[PDB]
Amino acid sequence: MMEQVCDVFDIYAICACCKVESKNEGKKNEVFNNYTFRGLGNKGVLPWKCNSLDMKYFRAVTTYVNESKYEKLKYKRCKYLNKETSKKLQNVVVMGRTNWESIPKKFKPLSNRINVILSRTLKKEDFDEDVYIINKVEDLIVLLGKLNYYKCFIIGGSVVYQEFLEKKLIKKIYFTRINSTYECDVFFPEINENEYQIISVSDVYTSNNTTLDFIIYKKTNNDDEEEDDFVYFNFNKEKEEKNKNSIHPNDFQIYNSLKYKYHPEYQYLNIIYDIMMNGNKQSDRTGVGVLSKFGYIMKFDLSQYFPLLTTKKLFLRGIIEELLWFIRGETNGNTLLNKNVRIWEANGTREFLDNRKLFHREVNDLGPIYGFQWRHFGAEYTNMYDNYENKGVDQLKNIINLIKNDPTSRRILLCAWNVKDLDQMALPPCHILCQFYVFDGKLSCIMYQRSCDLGLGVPFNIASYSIFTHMIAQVCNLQPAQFIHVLGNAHVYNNHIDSLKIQLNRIPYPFPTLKLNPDIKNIEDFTISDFTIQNYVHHEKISMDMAA
Amino acid sequence: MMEQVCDVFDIYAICACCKVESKNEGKKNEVFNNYTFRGLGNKGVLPWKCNSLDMKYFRAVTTYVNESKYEKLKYKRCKYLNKETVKKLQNVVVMGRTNWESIPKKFKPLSNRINVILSRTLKKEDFDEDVYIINKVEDLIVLLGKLNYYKCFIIGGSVVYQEFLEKKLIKKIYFTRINSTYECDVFFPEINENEYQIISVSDVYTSNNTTLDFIIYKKTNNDDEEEDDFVYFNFNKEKEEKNKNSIHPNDFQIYNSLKYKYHPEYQYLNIIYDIMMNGNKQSDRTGVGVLSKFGYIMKFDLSQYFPLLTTKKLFLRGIIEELLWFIRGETNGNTLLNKNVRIWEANGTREFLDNRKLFHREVNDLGPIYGFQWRHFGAEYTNMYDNYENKGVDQLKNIINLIKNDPTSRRILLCAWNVKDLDQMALPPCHILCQFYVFDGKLSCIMYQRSCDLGLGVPFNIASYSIFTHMIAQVCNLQPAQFIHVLGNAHVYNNHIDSLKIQLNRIPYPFPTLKLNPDIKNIEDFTISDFTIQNYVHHEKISMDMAA
Ligand SMILES: NC(=O)C1=CN([C@@H]2O[C@H](COP(=O)(O)OP(=O)(O)OC[C@H]3O[C@@H](n4cnc5c(N)ncnc54)[C@H](OP(=O)(O)O)[C@@H]3O)[C@@H](O)[C@H]2O)C=CC1
Ligand SMILES: NC(=O)C1=CN([C@@H]2O[C@H](COP(=O)(O)OP(=O)(O)OC[C@H]3O[C@@H](n4cnc5c(N)ncnc54)[C@H](OP(=O)(O)O)[C@@H]3O)[C@@H](O)[C@H]2O)C=CC1
Ligand SMILES: COc1cc(Cc2cnc(N)nc2N)cc(OC)c1OC
Ligand SMILES: COc1cc(Cc2cnc(N)nc2N)cc(OC)c1OC
Ligand SMILES: O=c1ccn([C@H]2C[C@H](O)[C@@H](COP(=O)(O)O)O2)c(=O)[nH]1
């Protein structure tokens, strides 16, 4: 409706923001929000000196025009200033003198753009380079009114942002989240949850030893016969989504208001959306009640990020201890309970072993599960205390030796589904197999999962099998490529829906990175201390069962 | 500069065509083309009588209008026709008199459509109904230049379709391929490969005991600041696909010209494309050589069709014989060789077994492969001839019991990959496992394939596990729903590229159906003659190695 100057003159802002090096007062119990990324500068330069990929983005966003689109904009513009009217078409960039003087010399003036400097102290006079000056903010709307520009971009710094934001002159913010912590003296202003709303989250990337992503904030309110062919080919599609009334999508205003959902966490989130909306109502094993669907695939680029969900808090100590426990060959539930890892406690009780008909199994003797099948597949299992040295097939050695000696084998599979020993296990494995693939000094891993609890379980599963990939890759002197997660029976407990709905409306943060201690070169030689998650920025912990 | 009458007045053709009961004298092996589908009428009615879904398509297309797109169409019609001006908007349908009389009284005149009838024999006075009688094709274009209408549909019959193409007054043909054979007396005119081309192929469907799909012929030749965010987001891609120049897109002229590739065969065809364009070049030692990628999922709706590739010829006797062999628990190659099925011949050789270090293994004794594992997993393998009675886990009987008695179990897997036995097998299994899923008395099957020969092996693999799905579904008194194919290591052999390029440019035919003998109530009691593929319409056989 009507039109503010921001809409009319197509004036956007572009920035790139750090986390700040505060003296945290014995509180690794840290809360994170949109204001977490503000850091703009330090001693008159960027706090990270150079981020090569952001520098690529910033250029491509400021140096892009479509001539085609210009016609419409020249109308709506000229008709409003009430004055109705070869080089090339170009974008404007607006910068504070301080920012101008903090840009290196080689970049000045910014190629194929219309460089403008807001300054009161200096004037066209003082600048030995091809520019325009101005000494107030109203003076820019004027320079815009006259010139041949496709879009105008506010490229900082803080002072210039704060005032342009105050008088709501900016239509969108193209905002780079640099997901590391540096020293900062200057800061981006507290963006107003009311006035501006994220509408788009890019992919996550690694550049110069840090992950980063690109989001878009939007200002608040208040062939054609080939398109018909689409409608005809969609003629048999059911009228509305099956559990529409049942889940009520109008609740996910934010999830649905996003245009571009290119953050990899959306791979998980969209499966949760898909199941809630089109999932089959099933009720048994307990009468507990699930929405279920069959056969999904998620791919994470471990070279660019560690995919630890950011739409809730996750803890990995337990997940890692469990991984190290499989690797040692162990089936002894006590080892994990002494480290207060209680993943397997429920499946070791006398009651649970008795329902599972294992009347002759010691409590917490989980039987021939992951660890035993990894290092001794085929061996007759006895009890958790037996050393099975040299008995059965050590698949874990075998697949590590296949990667090193025969990277191009298509038989690098690690299988926990021993059909002979299923009934002897406390619980047959949810995680059926990993298969590996080596290209050009790079390791990908497929994990097939028969049964996927999506609100409690798969989030941990992603992390486990991502960590395991790294461990394998390092041990075989390879770079990790993709973790590919194949979901079989994929289900949401009805108990989880209220919490997953809260979750779906949270905008993921840039993912963290995993640092393995590089000295560890045998799969058996990892210690809990060898693992570090770095720069994990996350929303509040969610109880998935909202019970009390 | 000419503007076409068919573009200006938006004149379209819609039809439904079956195969003709033509005298196929010594043609049991017969050649198939787009004219295989040409049957329109028999004795003044449709050769198939009712097809519910053809009817639902026809109604949707011939009624559907869009008001926004009228303002432009009126402007264009007025311009061409000299004019300028400016209740509920409709399409015109144009039938011949025989067609009109062929249509049941309960459908006439056609709802929410302007009905035009061509006739000399009959004048306006011989009708009671709300229709326009015209007596020549020129009187239509007169009437179209007077009326408000969205689009004009020629709905037959044969004489009407004929003259409208004689005069190139048809912009596109919406053609329903009814994949069944019927007595016909009236035929659609042979479409001229030069004047018209297929730009779109829909999903395949089952209705009234036939498969059918929808194809579109086209006449041949002679906030958008939110479309800007899309370009910003794709700022970091390559200038090419890895081996783009290596293969050349301009070779897939037909494949790339199609707009909507909604036929399920494209799931297979599109993976071939993705591997050819983005595949990694690898060597299986000694320089055998492949393009590989990792982790793809295809899904086929067995309730709607049987997915036997139609873009080359496939025989299924061998494949069914192999599967019966598996089910009996056999490991004996000779049983197949005596049935003239050579699938396992190469793998059963003295040279081949000796190369797998199986020096104590009789010729054509393939050892503990699928058959042995499905019925005896865990038993120590002796030889081909040992009846391994009540030994190992019979996981086939176990999964058939889970399905009929615990249908919501997430533990209904059938595993071939017995790690103990791998080195004793002629070949580790390519097909790792099947998982099943029951909902609302319908059965779906995932199978995970570690190594996938896209040109030669996969087409047969899709058939094998699609038939197995039907077999299990029947024996457990369920409907077949989905066969879901999870590709691990997906590779095209360099030998296969020339042939696949040919296959990629062939347009699929509607898939055939599969009928099982309904009497068989145990998985053990199936025989070759209990299996019949109805209506396999396919392109010429292709040899993938064009070698000599
Ligand atoms: N990562 C990022 O996105 C960005 C990083 N930066 C960081 O920003 C820092 C500098 O920013 P900051 O110190 O806030 O300064 P600014 O770049 O915002 O410039 C401030 C100066 O601009 C002039 N000015 C501001 N408002 C007006 C006005 N309304 N009319 C006229 N002149 C005006 C004045 O200069 P004068 O007194 O001469 O008139 C003022 O002192 C650098 O260290 C750099 O690292 C900079 C841009 C973006
Ligand atoms: N499967 C499908 O998509 C379709 C099926 N059909 C089937 O096709 C059959 C009918 O086909 P067909 O026999 O070719 O009949 P048509 O529907 O083509 O009717 C032909 C008759 O229409 C009139 N007519 C046609 N063109 C003209 C013209 N230019 N000027 C004046 N009158 C004209 C004449 O009727 P008159 O004798 O009164 O002068 C002519 O004999 C039926 O069996 C029907 O079931 C029909 C439509 C489509
Ligand atoms: C092109 O070089 C620079 C650009 C910027 C501004 C800037 C940089 N990145 C992003 N995303 N937005 C911005 N507004 C700031 C700079 O340092 C102060 C630069 O020099 C290193
Ligand atoms: C809606 O009823 C009928 C429609 C048609 C024409 C027709 C039907 N289907 C398609 N795909 N194209 C057509 N032109 C033909 C008919 O029978 C001769 C009908 O009566 C059942
Ligand atoms: O890592 C794990 C372990 C367990 N589960 C869940 C999936 C199912 O909800 C349940 C397995 O029970 P069955 O599928 O065997 O019935 O545990 C997971 O999602 N991830």
Ligand SMILES: O=c1ccn([C@H]2C[C@H](O)[C@@H](COP(=O)(O)O)O2)c(=O)[nH]1
């Ligand atoms: O039903 C079958 C049998 C074999 N293969 C192919 C896949 C590989 O090209 C090859 C097996 O090679 P390895 O995976 O054993 O390395 O056989 C199939 O695609 N389908």
